[PDB]
């Protein structure tokens, strides 16, 4: 579950050795960053509704067909509009998780792994989600470190989609 702390412990255990100063340097890295990371998560959590709505709209704007084509993979009805927010919500939640964990771990385990099939099967477009994420990037309005980290996870989701 890729985080600085578990990674560090994990190599150590895989080489059957006690934690050395190296792993302490890792912990240090993690804990120094956490400042920025936790502020960043809170910010995102309180902008949650604005951010979801906003991104949903953004995708519907880039890809208008998604609001009019018939059938269940698209968002012409309320049902589908709902699913779409739901999912974007998922992406954002994962992003907050990453920030708190200090690594991609939780997005990796809960969302990225198996996304390929889900999208292929239900005929969803990676491109849609890529836009959603692009929007969250340009609209979380975070400063300095909190920004450069959050954006890392956002871009990571994007990269996992191409």
């Amino acid at each position: 579950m890729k985080t600085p702390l578990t990674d560090a412990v994990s190599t150590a255990d895989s080489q059957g050795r006690f934690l050395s100063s190296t792993e302490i340097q890792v912990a240090f890295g993690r804990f120094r960053q956490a400042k920025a990371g936790l502020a960043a998560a809170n910010a995102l959590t309180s902008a949650a509704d604005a951010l979801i709505s906003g991104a949903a709209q953004a995708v519907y704007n880039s890809f208008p067909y998604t609001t009019c084509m018939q059938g269940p993979n698209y968002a012409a009805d309320q049902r589908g509009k709902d699913k779409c927010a739901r999912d974007i919500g998922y992406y954002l939640r994962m992003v907050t998780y990453c920030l708190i964990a200090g690594g991609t771990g939780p997005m990796d385990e809960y969302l990225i792994a198996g996304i390929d099939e889900v999208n292929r099967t239900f005929e969803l477009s990676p491109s849609w989600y890529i836009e959603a994420l692009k929007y969250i990037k340009a609209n979380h309005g975070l400063a300095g470190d909190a920004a450069a980290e959050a954006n890392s996870y956002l871009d990571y989701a994007i990269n996992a989609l191409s």
């Binding site: 579950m1 578990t6 050395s20 100063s21 936790l38 809170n42 708190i100 771990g105």
Partner: protein
């Protein structure tokens, strides 16, 4: 395995929620005491072989039937293995601390140990005593005021004790 953060991130996801203002603060505090925890790890680690060896020696003095011919620690093969376990339990306990979550320890070390020992004919209670002796000595070594910034490490100590305590518990 979970680390203290990831443990929380795990429970939240099964609820479909983002971590509450309350729980971020709890974690943020754990972050502020980061330095002590790392000290606790460096101190126990920087002394592993005193901690093990001294504990082992007390145990044997205390329970000589263990190293008398016929007992479970007589023969170099076995003595060596017995020391190895002590060291292992200790190593896992240090991982728990570093990560602030019992999981590394429960999963990769304590789980199923009771039945390995039962099947081999190793006396768990004995291993427990040994683990117990390392707990005391480890705790002394972390609480020693020499050569460090003064502060309260009492909460950390209580946590460290916890981990040892469950290693022992896990073999009785």
């Amino acid at each position: 395995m979970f680390d203290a953060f990831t443990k929380v991130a795990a429970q939240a996801d099964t609820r479909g929620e983002m971590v509450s203002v309350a729980q971020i603060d709890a974690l943020s505090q754990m972050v502020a005491e980061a330095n002590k925890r790392l000290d606790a790890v460096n101190r126990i680690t920087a002394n592993a072989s005193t901690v093990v060896s001294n504990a082992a020696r007390a145990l044997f003095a205390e329970q000589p039937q263990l190293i008398a011919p016929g007992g479970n620690a007589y023969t170099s093969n076995r003595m060596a293995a017995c020391l190895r376990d002590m060291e292992i339990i200790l190593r896992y306990v240090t991982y728990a601390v570093f990560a602030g979550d019992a999981s590394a320890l429960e999963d990769r070390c304590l789980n199923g140990l009771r039945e390995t020992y039962s099947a081999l004919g190793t006396p768990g209670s004995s291993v427990a005593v040994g683990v117990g002796k390392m707990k005391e000595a480890a705790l002394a070594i972390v609480n020693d005021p020499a050569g460090i910034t003064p502060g309260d490490c009492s909460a950390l100590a209580s946590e460290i004790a916890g981990y040892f305590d469950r290693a022992a518990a896990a073999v009785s």
